[PDB]
Chain length 114, copies 4
């Protein structure tokens, strides 16, 4: 199944934050309405924040997370969770190798903000 694709409410600010846990430099692309809206890159084996941004979900609310290591797409896993019918998390993990820890880049999207 498709992973790393979320429908947010239209025209809504959201946070995106990426962490790294891999020997490889992670490249995280965040697409809004099928166009690149933010790109992060960094390397850490200690959960370093390689990127954090506030974006607008745009008129469609379509947000996609892609992860690559030296141009090779990582295998993604994802889910959305809503707490108390208000607080939204869109969560992505990614696997760049064979150990299947799925933490090589970790991306958290959260809304609403403010």
């Amino acid at each position: 199944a498709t992973q790393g694709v979320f429908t947010l409410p239209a025209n809504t600010r959201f946070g995106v934050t990426a962490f790294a846990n891999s020997s490889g430099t992670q490249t995280v692309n965040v697409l809004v309405n099928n166009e690149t809206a933010a790109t992060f890159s960094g390397q850490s084996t200690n959960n370093a924040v390689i990127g954090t941004q506030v974006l607008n979900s745009g008129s469609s609310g379509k947000v996609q997370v892609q992860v690559s290591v030296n141009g090779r797409p990582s295998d993604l896993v994802s889910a959305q969770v809503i707490l108390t019918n208000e607080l939204n998390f869109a969560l992505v993990g990614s696997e760049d190798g064979t150990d299947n820890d799925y933490n090589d880049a970790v991306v958290v999207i959260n809304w609403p903000l403010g």
Copy 2:
């Protein structure tokens, strides 16, 4: 029900990251085995990362998040999500006021690391 309390695997490194979305200064305390292990403070209405740390779950694996705003405890909501049977997120939202957006401090715990 109790919220903001999670049992991790023993002796396991985890990341904890806090975000703020409120007029009020958030204080986020992260306890391991009932002992303060990290404290973050800050004020943002735009999802600032008021802090991020790597901690060890220790012999009990017990991790608790507490949030307060000038010494008043915020109301918490929480859940844990596991992707592909391997990648763990422990999620907390908090409310300092009356609007019930539960984003006033947002805390994300993730493991495993590395």
Copy 3:
């Protein structure tokens, strides 16, 4: 925080299914736009299905689950989870006593159907 309250898409059919794990007879009320739309009641310590039904979320999409044991309201825990941006679960646990297993009535709401 409020629990057992979910906003579904308007005018959308959903499944609601309850299970029991308690010495107490569980009463599960499902409200749609603040009106009782289904009531299940039953007793099991072995996860028996005490009721299943398909409802329509109506113009508001507001669905609420309440659980009581002989008119005593149970404490609830809840969350919504979305897989591959398509499949929705609204999950409720409930506690009627002192052991805090929160399984005394378990309610699963799922959509879309068909």
Copy 4:
């Protein structure tokens, strides 16, 4: 990523329940330590509960859900969620066709019981 595989606590009773939403007859297999422990089957476009059973997770705690429609394996999506650090749901959706509703067989595993 692998989907429909969950590590439960060893030697623990759990509920497994399947729902159908498809023109195709669903077959759900539930494996415990890599051996078939339960098989459910039915055909519904209205969320019929085609099976529900209580199983034991056995010494490994490994539970796997597989879905097929006239011998063709369906594509799976899954996650586990934990509420109040106690109540566990392991969730599976499946796709037998081209519309990607992922509801064609829906499986819910819940523990603890009793």
